[PDB]
Amino acid sequence: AQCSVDIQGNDQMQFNTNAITVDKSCKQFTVNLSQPGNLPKNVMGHNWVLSTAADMQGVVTDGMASGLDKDYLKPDDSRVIAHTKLIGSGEKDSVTFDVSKLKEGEQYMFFCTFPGHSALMKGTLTLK
Amino acid sequence: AQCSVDIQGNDQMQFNTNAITVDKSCKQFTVNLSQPGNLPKNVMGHNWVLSTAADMQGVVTDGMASGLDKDYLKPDDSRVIAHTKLIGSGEKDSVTFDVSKLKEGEQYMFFCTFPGHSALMKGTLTLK
Amino acid sequence: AQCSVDIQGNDQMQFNTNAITVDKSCKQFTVNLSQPGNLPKNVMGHNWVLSTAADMQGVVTDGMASGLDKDYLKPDDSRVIAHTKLIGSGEKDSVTFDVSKLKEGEQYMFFCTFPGHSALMKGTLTLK
Amino acid sequence: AQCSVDIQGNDQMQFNTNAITVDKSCKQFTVNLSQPGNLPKNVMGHNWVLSTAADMQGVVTDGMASGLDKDYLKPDDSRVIAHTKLIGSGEKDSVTFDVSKLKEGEQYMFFCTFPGHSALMKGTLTLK
């Protein structure tokens, strides 16, 4: 609602939303991530990473190779527009980015880079 | 929250929650279902059906055999404790049920009976 | 084997293979898709579509927006290297494509673009 | 060939077969599982568990909760007909079960109980 959304990854390896629309009138957008289940981050840790639909596979491939030590994301990956940290059960993290970094007409995807999760834990983001 | 929950079934064949807790102080519990997407019910229609974990397969099987006109649910199926109608994009439907029909110590599952959807559209309901 | 493969999509939204190897000596390669199930194409239609692993998500998103009469594929989608049409119960279709449209090394994916199906219906194709 | 099948589960949560046919003439049947991948047991561990289709959801829920050291299976779960251990990268494990445990006219499902996996890692087993 407004320029923010609350997203949560769960023990079923699913996100509560698979589509986000950021209104043109937002200077910034905030994503508050929560993990309501009871599984440790090493078994079911989730994060929210945003890139272009085109960069999704690269980020996911380089990400799952970095280990949970690096939250399953290549450090200083340029394709990642914004991301949360990798959290487990009971944790929460928020990320805020400037809407100036998104152009109308392009397709973005948000996803979880923890091994295998991106199969279900993905979704669309669009600036309208 | 209180004795109602709002559930969304979306166009990527996912519910927004896969676990529901019904407080024992609720005499009645209310599920409000909405379809936030743009696809029609003949293609991506969703409902919320409740049964025990044990009956889920029997209900899903007899259900997809009944067709769209029967909301993909078998009429007078005694395994269903409560259910919505099958809704499409933009539609909404609520169903209140009596919490005295659930008991402590039983595993219940909620699911969508539209063909194939219960693989991802399923979740737990337990009384507490 | 050699320059043809046969594949079946079923009512549980599963292809009977996860990987297709294309012998680099094949001039053209045929894929023969069949739907042995009972569900109609509007409820469980399956097609076989081929793109690079990087372009698949774009193809899946523009696909579901194009509707059933367009086989849930964007018309003249540059990223689609080859594709069958959407078939329902009983039906079969093939596509024969030129093998020089694939370069080796690169990763390719085959998947179904009918709504919600690609999360379960996908696999890899390698030129070997 | 013989009363045996050899099955793989890859790092992308996919078993290499959706269906297993057990010829009625076998006294016992053996499944030989291999995880031909690079990811370890705690991240992408897989197992082959067998139950009737009606019991699968119960097995998965109670399995999830049991933890890795219990191979994500409730100890002495009467609904589990047969199962392998939970394995990871380059491991193999076999299970042999009496075909007398199965009666025809009942539907069986094989699946992985590692968290999240069950929805994608599944298939049917039938007696012929």
Ligand SMILES: [Cu+2]
């Ligand atoms: Cu995750």
Ligand SMILES: [Cu+2]
């Ligand atoms: Cu549904």
Ligand SMILES: [Cu+2]
């Ligand atoms: Cu399909």
Ligand SMILES: [Cu+2]
């Ligand atoms: Cu597994």
